[PDB]
Design a binder for this molecule. Structure first.
Ligand code: HEM
Ligand code: HEM
Ligand code: NIZ
Ligand code: NIZ
Ligand code: NIZ
Ligand code: CL
Ligand code: CL
Ligand code: NA
Ligand code: NA
Lengths: 713, 713
C-alpha cells in the first residue's frame, strides 16, 4: 500500500510532534504515575525480585542458577542507548519493550528477561512502570549478588508507542563502517547525534572496531561512545569492569542457528524472538552475541576477580564456537565454573573490549588503581551505575521513593533549595513596571527569556530557565544567545533585582532566574499593548539561582543550540535541512505543530531573531504582538525565489511590480509550503484570528517558561 | 533515517488509529464547527464567490474570463475520490488540500483553484471550512452560469492531517495495468476497495483504457468505477455530460514542460506545483491533462450543446499538442470560442470517454433521452451533483444552513422523525428488567446490539443502530448477523416492545431501534453482575425505525462485514491478514488502539463470537464481564502453535503438560505478539485492572452504540 513517505520520502515529518497523544495512552487523562508509585510497597516488590533471581524457568534456564547477570545486562542496555547530543534514548521511557530497541541485535534474548518480569509487573500493575521495573531489577540483581548500590529513584512513567529517534541511516543491521550510509567519516569521526559504532549496537563492537580484534583501537571507540553517553574514563572503566564481574556471554554454536528478531517473528512466538535451532536452543546451548566468555571464578557474586584476571594472565587470540574473536588466558588452569555442568571448568577468557582496559594507557592507570584499591572500584562503580540509570530523569524533584540518594551530584545540574518567601502578585506587577521603566525593549526582554527557557529538552529533562544558568559559563557566551546584548540585559536586570531585594523585609527576595522569566512576560505584555490588546501573561515564581560550581561547563555544551529556528539561527551549514532541525527542536520542547507554528510566528514579530535579522520579520510593526507573520506569509500578492548568492535565503517580491518586500529562510517559508503547516498558518492568518493568535501565543510562551518546573508538579 | 516501517515493512500499523488527536488540531478543544457555520452569512459568501468567478488573477488567468469550469472540476474532484467499498475518500473532510490528493496527476492545477479561494477563506475564517467552501464554490460556479442546483448543506468540519487511505500498491504515478502491483486481475477485475483505473486518477483514463482510444471499452471502465462511487448509469451520464457542458481541458504543449507536483516542488513555490516551462506556463499556454478539448459553443453558460455536438457530428481520432489521443468533429465549422483570442474559433472536440456516452448502447439510450429532453438532463444532473457532493456527509441531521433540500432521498438511508415523547430513565430500567426476565442471554443481547451498531463507519458516516435496519433486508440475512438466532431475539424484543407501548399513555412509545440498543445495555449490565459488579450502562433514547421501502437494499450491501474481528468472523480467505482487517474495522469505528483492545477482550468473554466459536474465549466464566481474556492470553505458562489443518488457528497448550487449554485466531493472538498491542493487553491483564477494565469496556460499548447519533450533537 503506497504511502506519502514512499512518494515524497524527503518531505518533513510532523507526526513526531503528535506522538504520545491521549489517543494511544490506555491510562485515563488524569492518571498520575507519581502518585501511583508513591503508594507502591517498594519493599514488597524488591522481595519478589530477590525471589525471582533464582526461580529458573524451563523456557530460558538461569545460568549458574541465578538470573542476576542477565538482569544487569538488561538494565545496562535499557540505560545504554542514551546520547548526550540530544538527550534521546536512555531508560527513562521504558522504550526497550518497543520497536526498534526490542529487536536490536545487541538486545538479543533481553526479551526473555523482560518476560521473566511479567508476573511481578502484573501483580503490582500501574503502581510500577516497566521503565522503573527494568532499572529496579538491575539494582536487585546487584544487591542479590552482594554489591551495595548507591540508591534508586522511581518516577519513570511508561510510554505507549515508539519514540521517533534517529538511530542512523544504515539499511543493514550491524553494517560495518564506510558503506553508502556510513556513520563514520574522516579519521573515524562518528556523526552527531549517534553514540554507537554500528546500527543495533549499544556502544561498541565486543570483537573490536569493525570486527578487528585490536584492544588499543577498541579503546578509542569505547572512549568516544561512552563520552557521547556522558561518561568519562573513570566512570567507563568502573562500569565495564563492574558489569563484567558478573555472568557470562552466550555463543555455544553458529549464529546461523538463530531465527527472527521479535518484530519479525511469527505470531505464535508471542512477542519473543531469536528462537535457536542449536541443540536445546537455550541454557547451556544459548546463543546471544556469539561470544563465549565467562569473566570471573564466581559469576554470581561480587568479587575483585575481574582485574585479578585481566592483569594476572597474558592473553591469546582465539575464536568462540560461533566464530567470533575473543581471548583466552595463556597457560591458565580451568578455574571458571560452567553455567550448567558442575563437572566442567574453563580457562579465564576476555573480550577485546575488556582488554582495552589494560592496553589503552589511560585506562590502564585507572584499572591498576582499581585492582590495588578495590574499595575505590566499588564506590566508583556504584556511583557510575546510579548515574547511568538516572541520567535522563531530569531534575532531582522528579525522583521518587525511599531509596533516593541524599547526595547531590554535579551531573544532576542541581538547583538550590528555596528557603525564603516568594514574590506575590503585587510584587510581580511592581517588578514588571520597573523592567518596562528601565528602557529594556520588547525585543531584548523576549529574546533573553527565550534564550533562558528554550535550552530545555524533554528527552532527558535537562535545561530550562530554572538556575539562571544563562548568566554563567558557558551559556552566557553562546553565539545564539548574543553575548554582548545578553550581558547588557542581565546587568540591568541584576540592578533591578538588587534594588528590590534590598527594600524587602522578612526574608523575601526574587531570584535572577525568576526575574529573567518575569521580564520576558513583561515584554510580551508590552508587545500586546503595542498592538492595542490588554493581555496578562501568567507567571509562576520559585526558580532559584545555581552557581558556577554547580554547573559543569563541559556537560552544558551539548545543550548549545546550533540550530534554533525560533530565532532563525543556524550556527553552520548542515546536511539536514533547517526545517527538519526546526521540527526536531519543537519535539525537544514538547511542542505540537500548532504550538510550534504560533510560537514561531509570534517570536518573528517580537524581534527574537539572532542579530536583529529581518528574515521572516513579516510586519511593519515590529515589537507588537500581532498575527502579521501569517497574514503576510500567505499573501499571494508576493512571489518568492531563492537568492543567487545563497539558495537557503529567499526574496519575496510584489508579483505585479517586482519590488522586494521581504526576505526569509527555509524555516520561515516552510509554513507557506508544507501542506499541513500551511493549513495551520491559514487559521492564524484569517481575519477572525487576531485574538486567538494572542491567546494561543501567551499559552505556548507560558508553557515554554515552565518546561523545567517539576517543583510545581 | 531508517524507521521501524523500513526494518519491518509488513508489521501492522497502529498510527492509523491515533490521527486526528487534539495535538494536531489548531482549534480549541471546545470548538464546534456547526455552531460557527450556523452564524456564517452564507448569502454574503456566495456573493463574494460570484464576484470571484469573473475576477481573473494574472498568475493563473481565467479561461473565457470565467473560473466556473475550473471550480466545477475542483468540486467534482474533491467529491470524486469516494469509494462505496469502505466509504473512504469524498469531499467531506477537505482532504484535497493534503497529501497525496493535492499532488495527484488528475488534480493538476487545482492547486491554483484552491489558492484563488484563499482570500474568501481568510475573510470568513473558521465559520466556513475548506471542505464546505470547495463544494460551495462549485455550486456558485454552476449557479453563476445559469444552472439551478438542487441545494447545498454545510457541516463538513476541516481536518488537519492526511487520512490513511489505501489508494493502491503501485509505486509509479499513472502506471498502466498489468505491472508488478497491478490493481487488475482476471477479466479486468478491479481490486476492492479501489475505484479508479490507475494510481492518481479519479475514475478513468480520458484517452481510454490504459490509453487505448476505444469509447466502447472506455465505457466499461466508466460504468465499473462510477458504480464503485455509488452512481448508476443515469447519474453517470448526467454527471459527465453536465460537467463537460462547461469549460475546457488544457494541453497546449508537451507534458515534459511541466515540473514537480506540489508535494515535490521547491519551498519557494509556496504550496503550488506543476510549474510549466511552456511559453507563459499559464492561460492560453496551460498544460494540465495534456488534452486540448473545448466541448461547447458557450463554455461559460449552461446549455444542451454537449449532446447537440455529441450527436450532431461524426468524430475523428486526433492528437493534442501534447500527443494525447482525442477527437474532433468531421467537416465542422469553427464554432467553439477560443479561451483568450476573440478572433479565433475552433472545431468541436471530444474525449474518448465523452464518446462513450454515445457508443455504449446503454449510455446511448440515456444520452438520447437527455438530448431530446434537456429539462430531464438538467434535473438528473442537479440531483446527481447534490448526491456526489453530499454522499459522505452522513445522516440528514448533520446538514446545516438555509439551502438544505427538503426532499428526502433514498440514498440518504433516511430515518423518520420522532413525533412522540421518549422513554425516561425509569422506563429504561423497567425495559432492561423485562428484557433480562424474558430469558434472552447475555450473549444474545450483546451479539444483537453489536450487530446493529457496528455497521457504522466514520469514513462516510453510514450505518449504525439508528433505523433498526438490522430487522430488514439485507442486514437480517447477513451471515455475520446469524440470521436464525437474530430472528429469535428480534421476535422476543418486538413482543416486549408491543407490551410496553400498549400500556402507555400520552403517546410515549419506544422504538425497536432503541430497544435493541437498550437490550444490549441490559446484557452488558447483567454480565457485569455475573462478575460480581453492579454497573449502569449509559443509554440515550431517540432512535427511530426505518421501513423497508426507505431502505435501498443494493446500497446497503457494502456495509456487510465480511471481516469483523470483534466477533472473530472472516467470511472468506483474503490476501490481507486478519489482524490488518481488525485494525481497518477499528479505524472505521473511530476506535483508538486502547479502545479496540478493551472492546475485543470484553466481547470475547461475553459470547459475541459468530457461531459460538471458542476461538479467543479465554475464560471459564463466559457471559461474565471480566478481564480474563487478557490474563489468560498473557500467561507464559501457555505455549501456542499453529494447527496442522489451518495455519491461521492456534492451539494454546500447557507448556509443562501439553494439555490443550485454548484455541485462537490471528485476531486473538495479535494482542500477545504485537509489541504495542501487548503493552495495552498488559494494562488490562494486571491484578489491579478489574475496575478499569469494566469502566473502560462500558465506555467503548456506549461509544459504539452512539456512533450515528448526530441528533444528539
Ligand atoms: C565496552 C562496553 C561493553 C561491551 C562491548 C559489552 C559486551 C558484552 C557482550 C558481548 C555480552 C554478552 C551478551 C551475550 O552473549 O549474552 C555482555 C554481557 C554482559 N555485560 Fe557487557 N559489555 C559492555 C559494557 C557493559 C556494561 C557497562 C555493563 C554493566 C554495568 C555490562 C554488563 C554485562 C553483564 C552483566 C553481562 C552478562 C550477561 C549474562 O550473564 O547473561 N556490560 N557484555
Ligand atoms: C469519465 C469521467 C470523466 C473524465 C475522464 C473526465 C476528464 C476530464 C479531463 C481530462 C479534463 C481536463 C483537465 C484539464 O486538462 O484541465 C476535464 C475537465 C473538466 N471536467 Fe471532467 N472528466 C470526467 C467527469 C467529470 C465530471 C463528473 C464532472 C462534473 C460533474 C467534470 C467536470 C469537468 C469540468 C467542468 C472540466 C473543465 C475544467 C476547466 O474548465 O478548467 N468532469 N475532464
Ligand atoms: N553488555 N552488552 C552486551 O550484551 C552486548 C554488546 C554487543 N553485542 C551483544 C551484546
Ligand atoms: N525522542 N524523545 C524525545 O525527543 C523527547 C521525549 C519526551 N519529550 C521531548 C522530547
Ligand atoms: N474532470 N476530470 C479531470 O479533470 C481529469 C481526468 C483525468 N486526468 C486529468 C484530469
Ligand atoms: Cl527516546
Ligand atoms: Cl478519506
Ligand atoms: Na531520553
Ligand atoms: Na469518506
Amino acid at each position: 500500500g503506497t504511502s506519502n513517505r514512499d512518494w515524497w520520502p524527503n518531505q518533513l515529518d510532523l507526526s513526531i510532534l503528535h506522538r504520545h497523544s491521549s489517543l494511544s495512552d490506555p491510562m485515563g487523562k488524569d492518571f498520575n504515575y507519581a502518585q501511583a508509585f508513591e503508594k507502591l510497597d517498594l519493599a514488597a516488590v524488591k522481595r519478589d525480585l530477590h525471589a525471582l533471581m533464582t526461580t529458573s524457568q524451563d523456557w530460558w534456564p538461569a545460568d549458574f542458577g541465578h538470573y542476576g547477570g542477565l538482569f544487569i545486562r538488561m538494565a545496562w542496555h535499557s540505560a545504554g542507548t542514551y546520547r548526550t547530543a540530544d538527550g534521546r534514548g536512555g531508560a527513562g521511557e521504558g522504550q526497550q519493550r518497543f520497536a526498534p530497541l526490542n529487536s536490536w541485535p545487541a538486545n538479543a534474548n533481553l526479551d526473555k528477561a523482560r518476560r521473566l518480569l511479567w508476573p511481578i509487573k502484573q501483580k503490582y500493575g500501574r503502581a510500577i512502570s516497566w521503565a522503573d521495573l527494568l532499572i529496579l531489577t538491575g539494582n536487585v540483581a546487584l544487591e542479590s549478588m552482594g554489591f551495595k548500590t548507591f540508591g534508586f529513584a522511581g518516577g519513570r512513567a511508561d510510554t505507549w508507542e515508539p519514540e521517533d529517534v534517529y538511530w542512523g541511516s544504515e539499511k543493514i543491521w550491524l553494517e560495518l563502517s564506510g558503506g553508502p550510509n556510513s556513520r563514520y567519516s574522516g579519521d573515524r569521526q562518528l556523526e552527531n547525534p549517534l553514540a554507537a559504532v554500528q546500527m543495533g549496537l549499544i556502544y561498541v563492537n565486543p570483537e573490536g572496531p569493525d570486527g578487528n580484534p585490536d584492544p588499543v583501537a577498541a579503546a578509542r571507540d569505547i572512549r568516544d561512545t561512552f563520552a557521547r553517553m556522558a561518561m568519562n574514563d573513570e566512570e567507563t572503566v568502573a562500569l565495564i569492569a563492574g558489569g563484567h564481574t558478573f555472568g557470562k556471554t552466550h555463543g555455544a554454536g553458529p549464529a546461523s542457528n538463530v531465527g527472527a528478531e521479535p518484530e519479525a517473528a511469527g505470531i505464535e512466538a508471542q512477542g519473543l524472538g531469536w528462537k535457536s535451532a542449536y541443540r536445546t536452543g537455550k541454557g547451556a546451548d544459548a546463543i546471544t552475541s556469539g561470544l563465549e566468555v565467562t569473566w570471573t571464578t564466581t559469576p554470581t557474586q561480587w568479587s575483585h576477580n575481574f582485574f585479578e584476571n585481566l592483569f594476572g594472565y597474558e592473553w591469546e587470540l582465539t575464536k568462540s564456537p560461533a566464530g567470533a574473536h575473543q581471548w583466552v588466558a595463556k597457560g591458565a588452569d580451568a578455574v571458571i565454573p560452567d553455567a550448567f555442568d558442575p563437572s566442567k571448568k574453563h580457562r579465564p577468557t576476555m573480550l577485546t573490549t575488556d582488554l582495552s582496559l589494560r592496553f589503552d594507557p589511560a585506562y590502564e592507570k585507572i584499572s591498576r588503581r582499581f585492582h590495588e584499591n578495590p574499595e575505590q572500584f566499588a564506590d566508583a562503580f556504584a556511583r557510575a551505575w546510579f548515574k547511568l540509570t538516572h541520567r535522563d530523569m531530569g531534575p532531582r524533584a522528579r525522583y521518587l521513593g525511599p531509596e533516593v540518594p541524599a547526595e547531590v551530584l554535579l551531573w544532576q545540574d542541581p538547583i538550590p533549595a528555596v528557603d525564603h518567601p516568594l514574590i506575590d502578585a503585587a510584587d510581580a506587577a511592581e517588578l514588571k513596571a520597573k523592567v518596562l521603566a528601565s528602557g529594556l525593549t520588547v525585543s531584548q526582554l523576549v529574546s533573553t527569556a527565550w534564550a533562558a527557557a528554550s535550552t530545555f529538552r524533554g528527552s532527558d529533562k535537562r535545561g530550562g530557565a530554572n538556575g539562571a544558568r544563562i548568566r554563567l559559563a558557558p551559556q552566557k557566551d553562546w553565539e545564539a544567545n548574543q553575548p554582548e546584548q545578553l550581558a547588557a540585559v542581565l546587568e540591568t536586570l541584576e540592578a533591578i533585582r538588587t534594588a528590590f531585594n534590598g527594600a524587602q523585609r522578612g526574608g523575601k527576595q526574587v531570584s535572577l532566574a525568576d526575574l529573567i522569566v518575569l521580564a520576558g512576560c513583561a515584554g510580551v505584555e508590552q508587545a500586546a499593548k503595542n498592538a492595542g490588546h490588554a493581555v496578562t501573561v501568567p507567571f509562576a515564581p520559585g526558580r532559584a539561582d545555581a552557581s558556577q560550581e554547580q554547573t559543569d561547563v563541559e556537560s552544558m555544551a551539548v545543550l548549545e543550540p546550533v540550530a534554533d529556528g525560533f530565532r532563525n539561527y543556524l550556527k553552520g551549514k548542515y546536511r539536514v535541512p533547517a526545517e527538519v532541525l526546526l521540527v526536531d527542536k519543537a519535539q525537544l520542547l514538547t511542542l505540537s505543530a500548532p504550538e510550534m507554528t504560533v510560537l514561531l510566528g509570534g517570536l518573528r514579530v517580537l524581534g527574537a531573531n539572532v542579530g536583529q535579522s529581518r528574515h521572516g520579520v513579516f510586519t511593519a510593526r515590529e515589537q507588537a504582538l500581532t498575527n502579521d507573520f501569517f497574514v503576510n506569509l500567505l499573501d499571494m500578492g508576493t512571489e518568492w525565489k531563492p537568492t543567487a548568492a545563497d539558495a537557503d535565503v529567499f526574496e519575496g517580491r510584489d508579483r505585479a511590480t517586482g519590488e522586494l518586500k521581504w526576505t526569509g529562510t527555509r524555516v520561515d517559508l516552510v509554513f507557506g509550503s508544507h501542506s499541513q503547516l500551511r493549513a495551520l498558518a491559514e487559521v492564524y492568518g484569517s481575519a477572525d484570528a487576531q485574538e486567538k493568535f494572542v491567546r494561543d501565543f501567551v499559552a505556548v510562551w507560558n508553557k515554554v517558561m515552565n518546561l523545567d518546573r517539576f517543583d510545581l508538579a
